[model samples]
Target chain A: DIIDVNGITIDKNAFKVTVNGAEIELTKTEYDLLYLLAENKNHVMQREQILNHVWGYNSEVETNVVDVYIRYLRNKLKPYDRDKMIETVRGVGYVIR
Target chain B: DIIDVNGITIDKNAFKVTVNGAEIELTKTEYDLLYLLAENKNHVMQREQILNHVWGYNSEVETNVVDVYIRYLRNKLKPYDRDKMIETVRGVGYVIR
Candidate 1:
């Protein structure tokens, strides 16, 4: 239930990303998205996949919602300083670490 | 973790769902499934959509988990007339309209 990255502890269930013990905020969907990727750890997730679980497959409108949220996540996740921080597998999807 | 239906707040953190101030117990998968539908209110969710997100397409389990969970969810949510609560899209999948 915790996301530990670069010595930063992120509580998955609590949705609190603590960078060096400093609390950071995340929107509900963002938290879910990050947590999903972080939990998988090295698992390549697709856009539709993210939408289904994070956005709910039901009532799916299939937009660039995942991309938009990832951008937001990358912006908020400071000190990462990396190109494609989430790492895109081209036509695949995104992954964390 | 809350699902607020009829003035009852459902905290997404606590994973709690209430209708008319009554508590309802749901498994993690069920909670996620229901929350997705409730958020959309009245929208059709496809089978592919459910599988993509909840089941993790990368894994490729391809089981009947969604249907199983839907049946279970129906059992749990029938108190408030769940017959019409979780709808089926038939050739599509499921919906909450």
Candidate 2:
């Protein structure tokens, strides 16, 4: 599926992310988190849900780790101004808006 | 995406499988299922979810088909002693360990 969200095209199959056709590198976890949100684009993804989907339910890592990775992803997307693709829903979770 | 596990290599784009650098043949169904499990390496994949992704949501094929293919994959990997790559999660489903 084409992830053409404001010039951000994420190749879901190949797990490649690009902004305005320029590649945006991401770690495995970062890509997984971003892809999950993008896969359900425009939908609210709760912190717990993201934790389970991206980190897996069995993961012992703190749930708040999501926030950290979100930050990491945002930084990578900052240069391209595509960081806006991921929206934080105050008091809720995050979404690929 | 290059899938390398225990001397087994699956070239995602070419859909080729090689064990110990030697190609291991697989049917279309087998290849799809293996790719799915390999793609989500180290994670457990449930039968229903596997069926949905590998066979599509509208598939009327019995979920037991996953077991059948799992066995097929095991047989193919057994020659290279890599069948252990695909492990059954007992009552759950399967995972690439």
Candidate 3:
């Protein structure tokens, strides 16, 4: 399955993402996180949900860990000017709309 | 300050809400929770954030306490058919949109 939001396209089968036709290399964790968010486009996903899905429900990691990875994804997409595709919902979580 | 989303009108100054001109009585917690969600319409609010805002940041209450109050709000609005105004994002939080 392929998910496309805005100009970003995520190929679940290949675990690849391309922004406006340019492939962007992402870590495995980043790929999974982006896929989850992209699949739920326009809906905010709580940090807890992200942790459970991407890092495992029982993972001994702080919620801030999600923040760090989100930043990493943003930095990776910065050069392509697609960082804004992932948005922070403040005291909630993140959304891609 | 007042917030109007859909047909529900929240009078912040009076701490009252009316659906299509019909008054709906709600507990203080329910009112605050509704107000927070209404003010941030279309954006989800995490359970932890809701707990901190409605129950206080230092309150020892479990996050599920938010679920209970959300149900209360829904029950109160059910008579007016406005219960669906608040939506669940599943394993995430709530949103009013």
Candidate closest to the true structure, highest DockQ: 2
Model 2, range A5-82, lDDT digits (tens) per residue? Answer: 212122334434545646665666776777677667679999999999988989999989999999998898788777
Give the 10-residue window scoring lowest on summed lDDT in candidate 3 chain A.
Answer: A4-13
- Candidate 2 lDDT over residue span B1-97, tens digit each: 4433222222333333544546666666776777777667678999999999989999999999999999998897787777877888999999975
TM-score of 3: 0.43
Q: By the TM-score metric, which is better: model 1 or model 2?
A: 2
TM-score of each: 0.43, 0.45, 0.43
- Worst window of 10 by summed lDDT in candidate 3 chain B: B4-13
Per-residue alpha-carbon lDDT of model 3 for A1-97, expressed as tens digits?
3333212222322333545656666666886777777767789999999999989999998888999999998898788777888999999999988
Report the Cα lDDT for candidate 3. 0.72
Q: Docking category for candidate 3?
A: incorrect
Clashing pairs in 3: none
- Overall lDDT per candidate, in order of appearance: 0.64, 0.72, 0.72
What C-alpha lDDT does candidate 1 achieve relative to the native structure? Answer: 0.64
Candidate 2, chain A: TM-score?
A: 0.81
